[PDB]
Amino acid sequence: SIIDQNVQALFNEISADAVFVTYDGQNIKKYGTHLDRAKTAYIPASTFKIANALIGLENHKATSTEIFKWDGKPRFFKAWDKDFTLGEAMQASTVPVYQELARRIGPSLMQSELQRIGYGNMQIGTEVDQFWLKGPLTITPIQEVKFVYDLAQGQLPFKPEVQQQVKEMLYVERRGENRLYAKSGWGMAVDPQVGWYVGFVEKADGQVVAFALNMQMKAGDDIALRKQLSLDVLDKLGVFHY
């Protein structure tokens, strides 16, 4: 438990309510300032880009090589006023590209697919391109780690090539043969705001530790904290040493 103590000590400097869940295929473990967050359902925000890419590719609404052309209408960030593959958009977190994908998928299929995979509460409302940003779709940090753990292992109910393509869209960095995969999220249009850093670490031998940071955000918070903190934790856990 000293490892667990050292992880908790990092959270001493964190004002916000926060939980960091890990899953290694056997056990769920929970760290942070408010543990009940782990069983609480929040909107997925940009972490839904994971499920959206899977559903899209599985159902032949896009390929991972296909370019999503900027349509010329300026977008919320200047950074988004350009062309993207699904993987480039995953890393830039390019909302309008995934909105276009979701429109191609359509409400009937988006619905039936989330039901088929048990994603969160499987609710999409009437706006096929808004539901992960505004609700009504919600999901617990525990459900997010189990989801990405399965992705890491190719155990989701999607074609293996689909899973591998989406998996690699999430690749961030490696240290030796340990690989870090992740997706950030910040749901700004709900109260309270929710911040996510969801992913997994794949060891040399195929062992996986999935993780899900979930915390409360507010206006003006440091964009990079979610990652800094997840990394600090993974280092203290001995999962992804600096």
Side-chain angles (χ1 to χ4, degrees), residues 31-75:
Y31 304 86
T33 60
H34 190 204
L35 301 196
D36 274 341
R37 295 186 69 88
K39 292 148 24 143
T40 303
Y42 307 94
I43 66 172
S46 299
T47 72
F48 186 71
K49 279 174 182 87
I50 303 160
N52 196 356
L54 290 172
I55 289 167
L57 292 169
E58 182 76 11
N59 296 282
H60 316 298
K61 304 303 191 187
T63 70
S64 59
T65 71
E66 153 161 16
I67 289 167
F68 286 70
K69 301 147 113 39
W70 178 41
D71 60 2
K73 290 157 175 165
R75 291 161 164 183

XYZ file of all heavy atoms in Angstrom, residues 31-75:
356
model
N -8.207 5.811 -7.230
C -7.374 6.766 -6.528
C -8.019 8.150 -6.686
O -8.914 8.339 -7.574
C -5.981 6.776 -7.114
C -5.305 5.414 -7.129
C -5.517 4.541 -8.185
C -4.452 5.017 -6.107
C -4.946 3.295 -8.212
C -3.860 3.763 -6.122
C -4.112 2.907 -7.179
O -3.558 1.657 -7.254
N -7.635 9.093 -5.813
C -7.991 10.484 -5.965
C -8.630 11.165 -4.827
O -8.609 10.648 -3.717
N -9.249 12.337 -5.108
C -9.874 13.199 -4.098
C -11.398 12.913 -3.820
O -11.907 13.223 -2.737
C -9.671 14.683 -4.447
O -10.245 14.989 -5.710
C -8.243 15.032 -4.439
N -12.088 12.310 -4.787
C -13.460 11.888 -4.648
C -13.725 10.558 -5.415
O -14.119 10.522 -6.617
C -14.399 12.984 -5.128
C -15.832 12.722 -4.803
N -16.871 13.279 -5.518
C -16.406 11.974 -3.827
C -18.028 12.895 -4.995
N -17.773 12.082 -3.980
N -13.595 9.477 -4.665
C -13.723 8.138 -5.224
C -15.074 7.720 -5.822
O -15.131 6.884 -6.731
C -13.334 7.140 -4.128
C -11.890 7.280 -3.553
C -11.545 6.023 -2.805
C -10.823 7.528 -4.637
N -16.164 8.266 -5.296
C -17.510 7.974 -5.777
C -17.712 8.451 -7.200
O -18.605 7.966 -7.876
C -18.593 8.608 -4.847
C -18.975 7.710 -3.646
O -18.714 6.490 -3.680
O -19.606 8.226 -2.715
N -16.861 9.334 -7.686
C -16.886 9.700 -9.114
C -16.793 8.463 -10.021
O -17.309 8.464 -11.152
C -15.792 10.708 -9.470
C -15.898 12.055 -8.837
C -14.873 13.039 -9.344
N -15.138 13.416 -10.738
C -15.947 14.423 -11.134
N -16.577 15.193 -10.269
N -16.140 14.654 -12.424
N -16.138 7.414 -9.539
C -15.855 6.223 -10.375
C -17.078 5.487 -10.813
O -17.084 4.910 -11.877
C -14.953 5.252 -9.616
N -18.080 5.503 -9.958
C -19.377 4.910 -10.212
C -20.408 5.947 -10.681
O -21.572 5.642 -10.804
C -19.912 4.362 -8.916
C -19.145 3.160 -8.367
C -19.149 3.111 -6.819
C -20.329 3.853 -6.143
N -20.835 3.163 -4.926
N -19.986 7.167 -10.945
C -20.901 8.188 -11.391
C -20.790 8.417 -12.894
O -19.668 8.476 -13.441
C -20.557 9.511 -10.707
O -20.608 9.333 -9.312
C -21.554 10.605 -11.096
N -21.930 8.528 -13.544
C -22.026 8.678 -15.001
C -21.920 10.127 -15.401
O -22.665 10.948 -14.908
C -23.302 8.089 -15.517
N -20.991 10.442 -16.304
C -20.831 11.784 -16.867
C -20.886 11.677 -18.357
O -20.785 10.561 -18.916
C -19.475 12.332 -16.463
C -19.203 12.287 -14.965
C -18.526 11.223 -14.408
C -19.610 13.334 -14.116
C -18.292 11.155 -13.044
C -19.357 13.278 -12.775
C -18.701 12.171 -12.231
O -18.422 12.125 -10.868
N -21.047 12.805 -19.037
C -21.027 12.767 -20.500
C -19.573 12.396 -20.919
O -18.619 12.727 -20.220
C -21.451 14.074 -21.197
C -20.466 15.232 -20.934
C -22.894 14.453 -20.839
C -20.773 16.464 -21.780
N -19.421 11.664 -22.008
C -18.043 11.258 -22.440
C -17.196 12.369 -23.106
O -15.983 12.306 -23.147
C -18.315 10.129 -23.443
C -19.686 10.384 -23.966
C -20.481 11.061 -22.847
N -17.866 13.401 -23.597
C -17.215 14.456 -24.322
C -16.294 13.844 -25.383
O -16.662 12.846 -26.021
C -16.504 15.386 -23.341
N -15.121 14.407 -25.629
C -14.283 13.888 -26.747
C -13.794 12.482 -26.602
O -13.267 11.956 -27.559
C -13.090 14.805 -27.030
O -13.540 16.104 -27.399
N -13.950 11.828 -25.456
C -13.582 10.428 -25.352
C -14.548 9.551 -26.139
O -14.281 8.356 -26.384
C -13.549 9.903 -23.904
O -14.886 9.783 -23.368
C -12.712 10.783 -23.028
N -15.696 10.103 -26.499
C -16.588 9.390 -27.379
C -16.011 9.200 -28.779
O -16.447 8.288 -29.473
C -17.966 10.109 -27.492
C -18.957 9.325 -28.273
C -19.495 8.171 -27.749
C -19.321 9.690 -29.529
C -20.418 7.417 -28.440
C -20.225 8.929 -30.238
C -20.751 7.782 -29.687
N -15.084 10.036 -29.200
C -14.372 9.852 -30.453
C -13.792 8.478 -30.646
O -14.090 7.903 -31.675
C -13.262 10.853 -30.648
C -13.794 12.158 -31.162
C -12.713 13.194 -31.226
C -13.232 14.533 -31.699
N -13.760 15.401 -30.673
N -13.558 7.759 -29.560
C -13.169 6.382 -29.638
C -14.287 5.506 -30.159
O -14.110 4.805 -31.084
C -12.663 5.829 -28.289
C -11.497 6.644 -27.756
C -12.269 4.401 -28.455
C -11.235 6.518 -26.294
N -15.428 5.517 -29.525
C -16.535 4.670 -29.952
C -17.064 5.072 -31.328
O -17.477 4.201 -32.088
C -17.655 4.719 -28.949
N -17.060 6.372 -31.610
C -17.561 6.943 -32.879
C -16.693 6.423 -34.058
O -17.194 6.029 -35.097
C -17.488 8.461 -32.781
C -18.306 9.216 -33.843
O -18.900 8.626 -34.737
N -18.312 10.548 -33.727
N -15.395 6.378 -33.871
C -14.482 5.881 -34.919
C -14.711 4.384 -35.179
O -14.785 3.949 -36.302
C -13.060 6.197 -34.521
N -14.884 3.606 -34.105
C -15.158 2.176 -34.197
C -16.446 1.895 -34.926
O -16.493 1.107 -35.839
C -15.218 1.538 -32.787
C -13.875 1.426 -31.971
C -14.156 0.956 -30.562
C -12.865 0.465 -32.600
N -17.519 2.515 -34.482
C -18.796 2.345 -35.117
C -18.719 2.773 -36.586
O -19.172 2.046 -37.469
C -19.863 3.135 -34.323
C -20.128 2.424 -32.979
C -21.169 3.303 -35.140
C -20.944 3.275 -31.968
N -18.079 3.896 -36.871
C -17.976 4.370 -38.241
C -17.269 3.429 -39.201
O -17.712 3.211 -40.357
N -16.133 2.923 -38.760
C -15.317 2.029 -39.557
C -15.938 0.670 -39.655
O -15.877 0.037 -40.711
C -13.925 1.915 -38.937
C -13.004 3.157 -38.972
C -11.803 2.945 -38.090
C -12.532 3.496 -40.385
N -16.541 0.209 -38.556
C -17.196 -1.090 -38.558
C -18.283 -1.120 -39.559
O -18.517 -2.133 -40.193
C -17.821 -1.365 -37.208
C -18.507 -2.725 -37.062
C -17.515 -3.838 -36.909
O -16.310 -3.577 -36.701
O -17.942 -5.003 -36.970
N -18.989 -0.002 -39.695
C -20.178 0.032 -40.555
C -19.942 0.718 -41.914
O -20.890 1.046 -42.624
C -21.346 0.642 -39.798
C -21.749 -0.198 -38.606
O -22.421 -1.217 -38.752
N -21.310 0.199 -37.427
N -18.674 0.893 -42.295
C -18.323 1.284 -43.670
C -18.819 2.695 -43.996
O -19.215 2.985 -45.111
C -18.873 0.246 -44.678
C -18.660 -1.178 -44.262
N -17.405 -1.752 -44.077
C -19.563 -2.153 -43.985
C -17.556 -3.017 -43.721
N -18.851 -3.286 -43.656
N -18.782 3.557 -43.004
C -19.135 4.932 -43.172
C -17.904 5.764 -43.427
O -18.007 6.939 -43.801
C -19.854 5.408 -41.919
C -21.053 4.574 -41.584
C -22.033 4.537 -42.747
C -23.329 3.931 -42.302
N -24.253 3.737 -43.470
N -16.739 5.180 -43.201
C -15.444 5.839 -43.450
C -14.349 4.807 -43.424
O -14.539 3.728 -42.870
C -15.168 6.887 -42.377
N -13.190 5.168 -43.942
C -11.992 4.374 -43.758
C -11.063 5.233 -42.909
O -11.333 6.426 -42.691
C -11.298 4.078 -45.069
O -10.725 5.304 -45.565
C -12.293 3.531 -46.076
N -9.965 4.630 -42.433
C -8.985 5.372 -41.659
C -8.014 6.130 -42.555
O -7.151 6.839 -42.072
C -8.250 4.430 -40.738
O -7.606 3.400 -41.498
N -8.113 5.962 -43.857
C -7.199 6.654 -44.817
C -7.956 7.866 -45.485
O -7.346 8.820 -45.968
C -6.478 5.634 -45.780
O -7.431 5.123 -46.683
C -5.834 4.473 -44.960
N -9.274 7.792 -45.494
C -10.129 8.801 -46.080
C -9.923 10.202 -45.473
O -9.819 10.355 -44.265
C -11.574 8.358 -45.883
C -12.588 9.462 -45.819
C -13.986 8.971 -46.079
O -14.252 7.748 -46.026
O -14.821 9.850 -46.373
N -9.891 11.219 -46.327
C -9.682 12.563 -45.871
C -11.036 13.275 -45.711
O -11.871 13.240 -46.620
C -8.768 13.322 -46.818
C -7.364 12.787 -46.683
C -8.745 14.801 -46.464
C -6.420 13.220 -47.763
N -11.237 13.882 -44.546
C -12.414 14.703 -44.293
C -12.062 16.128 -44.615
O -11.274 16.771 -43.956
C -12.868 14.554 -42.878
C -13.557 13.240 -42.605
C -12.869 12.067 -42.587
C -14.921 13.202 -42.353
C -13.513 10.876 -42.324
C -15.593 12.012 -42.087
C -14.883 10.840 -42.074
N -12.625 16.615 -45.708
C -12.214 17.902 -46.264
C -12.854 19.021 -45.473
O -14.019 18.928 -45.118
C -12.625 17.994 -47.728
C -11.972 16.866 -48.514
C -12.764 16.263 -49.716
C -12.168 16.503 -51.063
N -10.691 16.394 -51.074
N -12.083 20.048 -45.148
C -12.647 21.223 -44.576
C -13.612 21.779 -45.630
O -13.276 21.806 -46.801
C -11.551 22.222 -44.247
C -12.089 23.508 -43.678
C -13.091 23.640 -42.781
C -11.633 24.821 -43.968
N -13.281 24.939 -42.494
C -12.402 25.700 -43.202
C -10.637 25.337 -44.794
C -12.217 27.078 -43.227
C -10.456 26.718 -44.834
C -11.245 27.573 -44.060
N -14.817 22.161 -45.195
C -15.851 22.668 -46.081
C -15.784 24.177 -46.225
O -16.656 24.747 -46.857
C -17.305 22.244 -45.660
C -17.699 22.731 -44.281
O -16.881 23.417 -43.661
O -18.797 22.391 -43.827
N -14.770 24.819 -45.670
C -14.569 26.249 -45.840
C -15.236 27.118 -44.786
O -14.878 28.302 -44.668
N -16.163 26.553 -44.001
C -16.861 27.315 -42.950
C -15.978 27.373 -41.704
O -15.653 26.325 -41.149
C -18.202 26.656 -42.651
C -19.177 26.841 -43.807
C -20.288 25.802 -43.858
C -21.285 26.138 -44.968
N -22.194 24.999 -45.303
N -15.599 28.588 -41.243
C -14.636 28.593 -40.121
C -15.222 27.889 -38.903
O -16.429 27.989 -38.626
C -14.386 30.074 -39.862
C -14.773 30.750 -41.146
C -15.907 29.946 -41.711
N -14.364 27.180 -38.178
C -14.761 26.322 -37.049
C -14.325 26.963 -35.724
O -13.712 28.030 -35.721
C -14.134 24.950 -37.253
C -14.737 24.190 -38.431
C -13.812 23.057 -38.899
N -14.485 22.080 -39.763
C -13.929 20.969 -40.266
N -12.681 20.650 -39.976
N -14.634 20.162 -41.037
